[PDB]
Amino acid sequence: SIYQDQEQRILKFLEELGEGKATTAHDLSGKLGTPKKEINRVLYSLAKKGKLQKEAGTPPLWKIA
Amino acid sequence: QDQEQRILKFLEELGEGKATTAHDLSGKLGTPKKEINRVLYSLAKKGKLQKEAGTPPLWKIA
DNA sequence: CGGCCG
DNA sequence: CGGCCG
Numbered sequence: 498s499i500y501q502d503q504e505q506r507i508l509k510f511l512e513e514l515g516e517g518k519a520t521t522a523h524d525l526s527g528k529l530g531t532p533k534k535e536i537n538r539v540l541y542s543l544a545k546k547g548k549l550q551k552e553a554g555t556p557p558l559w560k561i562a
Numbered sequence: 563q564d565q566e567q568r569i570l571k572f573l574e575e576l577g578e579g580k581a582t583t584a585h586d587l588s589g590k591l592g593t594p595k596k597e598i599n600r601v602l603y604s605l606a607k608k609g610k611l612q613k614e615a616g617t618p619p620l621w622k623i624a
Numbered sequence: 625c626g627g628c629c630g
Numbered sequence: 631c632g633g634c635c636g
Contacts, residue, residue, distance in 0.1 A: 522628090534628075541628040555626045584634090599634040617632045 503531060504539050511549065511561045519552060519560030565593065565601045570610065573623050581620035 506529055514520060522540055526533040540559050543549045550562040568591055576582065584602055588595040602621055605611035614620040 537628045538630095539628090545628095553626090557626075596634075600636095601634090603634045615632090619632070 500539070503529075503535065504543060506531075507536070507539055507543070508548070508561070511559065514560075516561050519550075519558040521556045521558060523556060525559070565597060566605060566610075569598065569601055570605065570623070573611070573621065578623040581614060581622040583618040583620060585618065587621070 507525060510525065510528065511520070522533055522536045525531075525540070526536045529536070540549065540551070544551045544559070548562060549559055552558040552560070569587060572587065572591065573582070584595055584598045587602070588598040591598070602611060603613075606613040606621065606624075609624055612622050612624040614622075
């Protein structure tokens with residue numbers, strides 16, 4: 498599934514960045530060439546489950562929990 | 563422009579005392595809520611429309 | 625400007 | 631659930 502392809506590309510990217518480090522949906526969107534909206538829906542969904550950790554701020558930071 | 567007059571026209575044919583949400587607006591003019599809100603927030607900044615902060619927010623003739 | 629939202 | 635936002 499595409500949606501699942503995009504969740505994995507996102508996880509793969511965050512894991513490659515490293516478990517500590519975090520980035521913004523914007524960088525993610527840019528690097529994966531996927532609209533920011535679609536990146537945030539996955540980002541917040543993966544976080545809603547507990548896979549990713551969202552650090553509040555503006556704009557929010559995202560890293561593998 | 564055409565949208566500014568439509569929205570204001572509906573908010574007129576409605577009643578300067580009675581407000582309304584963008585949603586009722588967007589689904590009454592066959593237009594995206596994004597458009598409605600763009601116009602709405604613009605018309606209010608100019609003073610032509612009045613916004614009552616809320617959730618949802620209500621708009622009426624100023 | 626945070627916006628994920630459908 | 632507020633979202634207008636490019």
